[PDB]
Amino acid sequence: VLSEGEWQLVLHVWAKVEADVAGHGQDIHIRLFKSHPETLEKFDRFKHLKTEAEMKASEDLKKHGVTVLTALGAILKKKGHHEAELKPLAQSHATKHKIPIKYLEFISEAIIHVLHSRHPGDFGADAQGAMNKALELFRKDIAAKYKELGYQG
Numbered sequence: 001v002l003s004e005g006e007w008q009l010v011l012h013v014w015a016k017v018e019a020d021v022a023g024h025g026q027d028i029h030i031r032l033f034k035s036h037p038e039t040l041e042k043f044d045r046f047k048h049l050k051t052e053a054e055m056k057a058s059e060d061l062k063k064h065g066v067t068v069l070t071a072l073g074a075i076l077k078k079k080g081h082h083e084a085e086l087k088p089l090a091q092s093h094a095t096k097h098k099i100p101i102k103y104l105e106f107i108s109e110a111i112i113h114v115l116h117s118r119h120p121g122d123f124g125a126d127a128q129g130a131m132n133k134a135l136e137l138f139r140k141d142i143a144a145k146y147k148e149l150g151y152q153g
């Protein structure tokens with residue numbers, strides 16, 4: 001469970017993300033694909049992208065990052081009461097895209113990295129710990145929904 005204080009630190013930094021959702025999404029995906037290249041293989045629509053500049057130039061990748069961060073933001077704003085928002089995500093990611101929890105760990109790492117790179121003054125140790133707890137909760141809850149669907153990833 002996160003404390004109310006922890007949720008407020010999470011949402012405080014999230015408001016900074018919301019000032020440029022597209023750019024944050026791009027940096028997060030680029031970091032993810034650079035640090036863990038195997039994850040790019042999951043995206044039939046993006047795996048053709050060969051360089052960082054191609055990734056930045058891709059309107060479809062930029063659009064996708066807004067979709068991803070919009071879904072995550074909607075989840076975070078529920079402060080743990082996110083069943084209705086999380087279930088459809090679990091359904092598609094377990095049954096269609098087949099994304100193991102370890103890949104969700106990888107993108108969580110990319111999120112923390114990008115938020116610190118862009119907002120160090122609003123993302124110190126305590127805020128990072130809070131965001132880490134929020135993403136840990138997201139991953140734990142999605143893993144339970146995965147199992148309900150029969151996926152052990």
Ligand code: HEM
Nearest residue numbers: 039042043045067068071072089092093097099103104107
């Ligand atoms: C913060 C965690 C993530 C969130 C919030 C998120 C959210 C979303 C959303 C909202 C969609 C569109 C609707 C849907 O199909 O469910 C989507 C699609 C997709 N996701 Fe994720 N995602 C996350 C992590 C990942 C990761 C790490 C991967 C791969 C390693 C992945 C793979 C995919 C793929 C392949 C699609 C279909 C893209 C397309 O061709 O249109 N997701 N995701």
